[PDB]
Design a protein around this ligand. Sequence first.
Ligand SMILES: *[C@@H]1O[C@H](CO)[C@@H](O[C@@H]2O[C@H](CO)[C@@H](O[C@@H]3O[C@H](CO[C@H]4O[C@H](CO)[C@@H](O[C@H]5O[C@H](CO)[C@@H](O)[C@H](O)[C@@H]5O)[C@H](O)[C@@H]4O)[C@@H](O)[C@H](O[C@H]4O[C@H](CO)[C@@H](O)[C@H](O)[C@@H]4O)[C@@H]3O)[C@H](O)[C@H]2NC(C)=O)[C@H](O)[C@H]1NC(C)=O
Ligand SMILES: *[C@@H]1O[C@H](CO)[C@@H](O[C@@H]2O[C@H](CO)[C@@H](O)[C@H](O)[C@H]2NC(C)=O)[C@H](O)[C@H]1NC(C)=O
Ligand SMILES: *[C@@H]1O[C@H](CO)[C@@H](O[C@@H]2O[C@H](CO)[C@@H](O)[C@H](O)[C@H]2NC(C)=O)[C@H](O)[C@H]1NC(C)=O
Ligand SMILES: *[C@@H]1O[C@H](CO)[C@@H](O)[C@H](O)[C@H]1NC(C)=O
Ligand SMILES: [Mg+2]
Lengths: 349, 1082
Amino acid sequence: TPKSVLPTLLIIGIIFAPIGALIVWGSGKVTTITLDYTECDVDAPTDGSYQAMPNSAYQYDLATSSSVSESSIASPTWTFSNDSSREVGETARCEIEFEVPYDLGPGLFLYYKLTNYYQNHRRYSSSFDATQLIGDSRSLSQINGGNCKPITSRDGKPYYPCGLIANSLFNDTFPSVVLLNPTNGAQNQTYNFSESGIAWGGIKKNYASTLTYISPSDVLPPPNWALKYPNGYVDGFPNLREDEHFQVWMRVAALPTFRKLWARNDGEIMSQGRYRIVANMNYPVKQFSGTKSIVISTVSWIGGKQPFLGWAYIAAAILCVVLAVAGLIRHLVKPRKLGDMSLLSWNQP
Amino acid sequence: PVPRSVFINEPLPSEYYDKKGKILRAHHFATNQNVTSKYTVITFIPKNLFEQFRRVANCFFLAISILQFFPKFSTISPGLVILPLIIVLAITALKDGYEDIKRHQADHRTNHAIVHVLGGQGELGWHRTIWEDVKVGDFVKIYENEQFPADIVICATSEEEDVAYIETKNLDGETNLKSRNGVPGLSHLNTAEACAKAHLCIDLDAPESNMFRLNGAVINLIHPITLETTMLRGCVLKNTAWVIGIIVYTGEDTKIIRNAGATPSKRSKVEKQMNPQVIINLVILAAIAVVCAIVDHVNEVEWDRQQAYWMLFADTSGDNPNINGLVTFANAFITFQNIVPISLYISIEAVRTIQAAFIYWDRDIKYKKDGVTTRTTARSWNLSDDLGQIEYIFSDKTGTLTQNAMIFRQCSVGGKIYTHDAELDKDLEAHDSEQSRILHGFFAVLGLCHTVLAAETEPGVIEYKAQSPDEAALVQSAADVGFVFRGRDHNILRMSTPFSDVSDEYELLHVLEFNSARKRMSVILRKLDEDGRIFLLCKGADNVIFERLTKDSNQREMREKTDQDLQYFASEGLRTLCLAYRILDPQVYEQWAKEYHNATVALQDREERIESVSSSIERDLILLGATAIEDKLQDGVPDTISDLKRAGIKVWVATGDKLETAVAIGYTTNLLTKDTNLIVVREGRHSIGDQLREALEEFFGEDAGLRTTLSPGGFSLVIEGHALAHCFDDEETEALLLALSTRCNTVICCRVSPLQKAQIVHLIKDNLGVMCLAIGDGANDVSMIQAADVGVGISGEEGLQAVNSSDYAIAQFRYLKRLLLVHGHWSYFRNSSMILNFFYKNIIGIGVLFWFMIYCGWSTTYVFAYVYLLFWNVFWTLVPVIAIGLFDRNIDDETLMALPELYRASREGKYFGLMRFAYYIFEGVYQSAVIYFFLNYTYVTTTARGDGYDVYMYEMSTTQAIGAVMVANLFSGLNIDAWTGWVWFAIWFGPFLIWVFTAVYSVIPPSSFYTGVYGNDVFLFRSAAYWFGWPFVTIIALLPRYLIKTFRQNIFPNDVDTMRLVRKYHPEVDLYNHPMLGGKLA
Ligand SMILES: *[C@@H]1O[C@H](CO)[C@@H](O[C@@H]2O[C@H](CO)[C@@H](O[C@@H]3O[C@H](CO[C@H]4O[C@H](CO)[C@@H](O[C@H]5O[C@H](CO)[C@@H](O)[C@H](O)[C@@H]5O)[C@H](O)[C@@H]4O)[C@@H](O)[C@H](O[C@H]4O[C@H](CO)[C@@H](O)[C@H](O)[C@@H]4O)[C@@H]3O)[C@H](O)[C@H]2NC(C)=O)[C@H](O)[C@H]1NC(C)=O
Ligand SMILES: *[C@@H]1O[C@H](CO)[C@@H](O[C@@H]2O[C@H](CO)[C@@H](O)[C@H](O)[C@H]2NC(C)=O)[C@H](O)[C@H]1NC(C)=O
Ligand SMILES: *[C@@H]1O[C@H](CO)[C@@H](O[C@@H]2O[C@H](CO)[C@@H](O)[C@H](O)[C@H]2NC(C)=O)[C@H](O)[C@H]1NC(C)=O
Ligand SMILES: *[C@@H]1O[C@H](CO)[C@@H](O)[C@H](O)[C@H]1NC(C)=O
Ligand SMILES: [Mg+2]
C-alpha cells in the first residue's frame, strides 16, 4: 500500500540525513598525520643531513575547520643513522621531521600502521595458548598438544609466550616526539607520550606476570626474542601483564592493514610547528612487501577520521527521498484503488 | 523348504532327526509374533543411529565433529561442538521412538488373542496359551467365536462329524464350509486321545504361497490333506462348538502375512524438491572449500618462500604448505558448517507433526452422530503439505459419497409403479386376481429370500438386524407393506402375511450372497401347507435374474415390461434388484438334494462343483418384479463436489452401480451438471479403442495440437468396466484414454473392480506425474489408497480396513473439502516459507563468513567468535522459522471456504520451486554483503571510540553478527502476514537473546572461561559505530525486500493478495452473493 510505503521512506530519509550529517561533522573534526618510514633504510641520507620525503610517503588529513590547505604544508624530511655503539633495539634510528599546521586538540593518540600483515590468517589468529598466558599449571605434553602448534617447545623446554602471535611482537619503538620550535624558550620541547593506558584495563587480566610451576631456566624465549633475551630469561619470567605493547599486539586485527595504539596523550595540546620523531627501525617488513607507518590522530565522539558511515547514511537518505518522491508522483498520476476486483483471474476478460 | 516331518511321539517335538541349525524346527525361531514395529529394545540404538546417519547431513556433522576432535582442527572443548548434533540426534530418536511405540502398542493390542492349545506332559492342564502358538508340534480344540491363530489340519469336531465353518472375512467375503478330514476321523479323538495316541506324519507341499490351494499329505503307522481339510488363517464362523486339529506350517508369520500385508512408506513432494536444494548447498560448500584451498596454498607458498611471520616454521610433515592446503580444505568444511541444514529436518518434522495435530483438533471436520464422535485423524504424521497440491481425486461411490444406509423408494410389481413404502398396495390387495397373486409372491420372495436375523423381544415391533444394508431395507419395507418376516428361531421360519402367521420350511440356503461374479442369493423353501410344494425364491442383480428366466407364454411380455420398468427406475437414480420364482417337482428336488448333499463334502475342488450345482438347479425361474432402493447421499456432497470442481481438482468416481443409474446419480451429485457434454463408451458391437479414438476425434480432433499426440461449457467421460479393462490391456488405447481423461474434469466409471481402481490410480499417477488422492471404505479402497500419493479413509459401516490403511481418516466428504482446501493450502504455504527462510538465514551466516574470507588470504578463519557461529541454527534463529511453519496464514479460512478458486496457487505449486530458492539465496548473499562490507569500512579507522583503543577483529565481528541476527529475524517477520503475538515473541526473542548473550558473556572475567571477547560490552555498546551501523545495515538489507514486496502487492497483485486487501479494507462485502465474487459462482 502506498500509504505504508511512501511515509515510511520519507521518515527513514528524514531520520538518516541528520545522523549522516552528524557523523560526517564528527569525522571532520579530527586530524590525522601519516608518515611512512619503511623505506628509510635505503633512501634516507646516511650522513647527518636531511632530505625531503617522497610525496607518496606522508599523508595529511586535516580538520574541516582548519584554514590551512594540504598543499601549504612543508614536505617532511628524514635521516637515517646506523651506528653499532648503542643498546640492542636502538641501532637503526629513522628521524622524521614533520610540521603540524594547526594546534591539535587535547587527547592526541599515536599509532603504528602495518600493511600486508595478515594477523587474521588461520595459522596466526589461533596461534596462542590461553592457559599458558593466564599462568595456570599446564604440563609440557599439553603445551605440545595446545594451539601453539608451530612454536611449542624444543629440547624439552617449552616457550613461555608460544605460538606465532607472541613470536612476531612489534619491536619497533618511537621514544621521542620533540617540538623543534616552541614559544616559551626551551629550543626543543618534548611532547610527552605516555606508554601507559595503551590497552584497556581488561586485557592484562588474561596474561600472568610470573609463572610458578616452572623455574625461570627451563623455559626458552621464542625464536625471534633472541636479541632482547640473548642468554634466555636471566632476570625472571617476562612480565607480560605489566607491558601494554604485547597485550595490544596479541589482539588479532580484522584486516591486513591495521593500526595499533602506541603511546597516548590526554591532557596536553600539540602546538603548531615542526616536530621530529625518532623511529628505531628493528622490525623488517620489506620482505613480504609490507609498509610501516606512524599515525598521529585526534579523537572525536565517533572515533577516528573515517567518514564512511555518515556519507553512507546521506546516500541512503537521498535514495529514500528519491524513491518516496517517485512513489508520490505515481500516486498523484494514477491512484490505483485499494481492493480492486478487476485484476482477479476470474474477473479479467 | 518344501518338506517337514511332524508328530513322532507326544506333543513338544523334542526330537525328529539331526540336531539343529538346518531344518529350523522345534522352537528354532522359525516363527514369531508379527512384527509391525521397527526394532528391538536392545537393538534400538544401532538401527536408530543408522537411520539417522543415512541422511547425509548428519554424517557430515559427525565427520565435522570428529575432525574437531583431533588437535589439528580443534578450537574449543568437544562438548560445545558436539552439543547441537547430540540434541538433533536425541530429538529425532525420540520422535521415531514415539512412532514405533504407537505401532508396537497397536500390534500388542492386536496380538495376545487367547488360544486354547492343550496337552502337556502335570499330565493335563495349563492350556489356554497366548496367540503365539507353540511351533508346529501341537493341537488346539478352538472353541466357538474364536479367531484362528494359524493354519491347521483339524481332525475332529465337537458337532456331528468333522465339518466346520470359518467365514473367511479378512481374506474374502463369502461364507465358508469344510469337507471333513478323513482317515484320522474317529481314530483321531480329542481330549487327551491325541496325546495318548501317536501316529501320522504330516507332509507339506509349498509353505511359500498357499491361497485357495493348501494341499498336503500324512502317513500313520498316505492321506490326501486338502485345502477344504486345512483351515488357513484369521477366519471365525464356528457354526459348530469347537474343532480340534494339529498346528502346522505357519506359527504366526508364514501364511497370511505372506498372502498380504506389504505396507510401503510415503514422503511429501516438498521433501523430494528439498533434496536437490540440500545437494546444491553441499556443492556450494565444497566449491568454497576447494577455492579457499587453492588460494591459500598459493599464498602460503608465496609467504613461505619469503619468510613472513604467519608462515614461520612450516618445514615439517604436518605443516608444509601442501598439507596446509589439505588442512585448509578441511577447515573450510569445518568453518561454513551452517550451510548444510542441521536443524532443518527436525524442525520440519516437528512442524508437520503440529500441522497434523491441528488437522486433528479441528472442530469443523469432526462428526458427531449417535453418541460416537469421529475425528479427522492424521494417520501419517507427514504428507500434510501434499493435500494442498492435489490435482486428481479418485473416489468410490458407495460408502464415501453415500451413507451406506439405503431406504426403499419404489417397488414394481408386474406393470404399475409405486411412489415407509405404503402406496396403493394396500388399496390394490383385494384377492382373486393375478396381480394380487403376483404381489403376494413378490412380497414373499422379498421377505423370506435373505439371511436376515430378526429380534422378537418387542412384540409388534420385531426389529431386524441384517448384515448387508440392502437386505435390511428390503425386509423392513416388506414388513411395513404387509408380509412380516416372523423369524427363524428354529429350522422352521415363519411369515406374518396380514391373515395369519403361516410358516415355511428351510432346507437349503443357497447362501452364495454375491461376489465371484455370482450375485444371486436364492434359497429353497417349502410351505407347511397340506400340499407341501417345493418352490424356489431368488433375488440378485438384474443381469443374472434376467438371463435366468423362461421364454414361453406371456412371460415375454412380462420380461419386456419389467425391463422398461427397470430402465425407468434406473433413470431416477435408483439401485435395481430383481426377484424370481421357481417351482420344483418333488422327484427332481430330492435327486438334486442328494446330489448336493454328497457334493458338499468332496475333498476335491468343490468350488466349481457348488457353482455348477447352483447353475443346474436354476432352470425355470419366473420373474416377479424389480425393486429399486435409493442410496442416501451424505449431507453436503453436492456442494463439496462443486467447490472441488471450482479448484481445478479433477473428481473421478469409480462407482459400483450401473452406468445409467450412476450418471452422477441422475446429475444430482454436481459431477455432471448442465451445459457439459458427456462422452459415453459402452462397447456395443464396436472396438473400445476405436470408439474412444473416434469420440476424441469428434469432440477435440479439430485441434491441431492434439493431432501431434495422435501420431456445452465442460467435458466429462463415462467408461464402465470393459473399456477400462481393454485400455489397461493394450497400450495405444491406454494412451488415448489418458489423453481424453486429462482433457476433462469429471470421469465417472461404473461397475468397476478393485484391480481396475488400483490400475486407474497407477495410470494417472505414473503417466501424468501429478499428485493424486484416493478415498474409500472397502478393501478395493484399501488397495487404491495404498497405491496413491495421498490416501483418505472414511469410517463407514463396511469395515475399518480403509481407515487403518490410509494417511487420513475422515468421516464425511465435506470434511475432505475443508481439509483439502484450508489445511493443505496453509500447510503448503507454511512449509515453503519455512524452508526458504531457513536456507536464507544459513546463507546469511555463511555469506558474512565468506565476505570476510575475501580479506584473509582465503585461510578459512571465522571472523566471529566461535560461540556466535556455533549457535546460529539454534537459539538465535529457529523460533521465527517454527512460527512461520505453525501460525502463518495467507488469508482467513472463511475466504478459502467461500472462494475455492484461490486454490490455484497451492495446486499449481507456485509456493515452492527453484526460482524462489534462487531468489532467497541471492537475497541472503546481498544482505550479507551489505552487512559485512558496510561494517568493515566503518571499522577501517583508528579507534571507533572516544578512548582511542584499537579496533580489532572481534568488535567488528560481533557488530556484524548482531546485525545479521537482526536482519534475518526481521526478514522472517517481514515475510509473515499473520502477526498474532507468537510471531512477535519469536522475532523479538531471537535478537533479544543475542543481545543478552553479548551483554553477559563479555563480562565473564578471564579467571574462568577465557571467552576471547572480554571487553566487547565496553567496545561495542559505548561506540557510535556499532549503534549507528547495526540499524543502518538492517534498514539497507531489508529495504529491497520491502520495496519488492510492496510492488508485488500493488503493481502485480495475486488473487490471494487482492482478496486479502478486499477483506481488510472492505469488511462489509458478501462473498457468497457479490456480482464480482462468489455471487457469480466463479
Ligand atoms: C625484531 O623482531 C624481528 C622479527 O620479529 C627479529 O628478526 C628475527 O630475529 C631472529 C633472531 O635472531 C632471527 O632468527 C634467527 O635466524 C637465523 C638465521 O636466519 C635464517 O636461518 C636459517 C638459514 O640458515 C633458516 O632458519 C629457519 O627459518 C624458519 C624458522 O625460523 C624455518 O621455517 C626455515 O625453514 C629455516 O629452517 C632461515 O632461512 C632463516 O632466515 C637462525 O640461524 C637462528 O637460529 C638460531 O636460533 C634458533 C632459535 O630457536 C635455534 O633454534 C637455532 O638452532 C639457532 O641457534 C634464528 O632462527 C630471524 O631470522 C629474524 N627475522 C627477520 C625477518 O629478521 C629481530 O631480530 C628483532 N630485533 C630486535 C632488536 O628485537
Ligand atoms: C645496520 O648495520 C648492520 C651492520 O652493518 C646491519 O646488519 C647486517 O644487515 C645485513 C642486511 O643485508 C645482513 O645481511 C647482515 O647479516 C647483518 N649483520 C652484519 C654483521 O652484517 C643492519 O641490517 C643495518 N640496519 C638496517 C640496514 O636497517
Ligand atoms: C613534557 O614534559 C616536560 C617535563 O615534564 C615539560 O617541560 C617543562 O616545560 C615547562 C613549560 O615550558 C617548563 O617550565 C619546565 O621547566 C619544563 N621542564 C623540563 C624538565 O624541561 C614539557 O613542557 C612537556 N611537554 C608538553 C607538550 O607538555
Ligand atoms: C635538545 O636541546 C638540548 C640543549 O638545547 C640538547 O643538548 C639536546 O641534544 C637536544 N635534543 C635533541 C635535539 O633531540
Ligand atoms: Mg465403497
